[PDB]
Design a protein around this ligand. Structure first.
Ligand SMILES: CC(=O)Nc1nccs1
Length: 165
């Protein structure tokens, strides 16, 4: 199972780790992707997860979008986890760099409550432009299921742990 995580609350855990390396190691039931509404996995966590699947995640995503249309900001879809997990929960957090409503971050984290345990990144953090300290706060105040957060950046991980209320 998950190892080396620091417990933040009854159900939220955090580790300074590469989510791709963490997923390849643990092979969780659910890995969360920091997706956009188009499921175009170009950069950040999405680009890294997609590259680990040898682009199979993008091929599957394009078929999903061709059939269903784009997701909503704050929404999600369950697709295959390929070589990383049983499933990938593609969750769309608001992209602050696109002027998307940050109040949608709580709606995005609510998607995690449909899964008993997840390996996940901080939603809307990184290239999505939101404050990662705010994202962690929304995570612990919204998610009731067991979430194992992988924070790639060591300096951000230390800042998140040392500032956690
Ligand atoms: C390679 C890479 O970006 N990994 C990440 N893990 C958690 C957040 S970003």
């Amino acid at each position: 199972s998950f190892s080396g995580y620091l417990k933040l609350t009854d159900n939220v855990y955090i580790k300074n780790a590469d989510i791709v390396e963490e997923a390849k190691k643990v092979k969780p039931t659910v890995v969360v992707n920091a997706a956009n509404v188009y499921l175009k996995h170009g950069g950040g966590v999405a680009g890294a997860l997609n590259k680990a699947t040898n682009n199979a995640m993008q091929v599957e995503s394009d078929d999903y979008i061709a059939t269903n249309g784009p997701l909503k900001v704050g929404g999600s879809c369950v697709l295959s986890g390929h070589n990383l997990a049983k499933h990938c929960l593609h969750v769309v957090g608001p992209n602050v760099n696109k002027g998307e409503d940050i109040q949608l971050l709580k709606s995005a984290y609510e998607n995690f409550n449909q899964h008993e345990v997840l390996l996940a990144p901080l939603l809307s953090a990184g290239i999505f432009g939101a404050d990662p300290i705010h994202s962690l706060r929304v995570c612990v105040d919204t998610v009731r299921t067991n979430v194992y957060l992988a924070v790639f950046d060591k300096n951000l991980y230390d800042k998140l742990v040392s500032s956690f209320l």
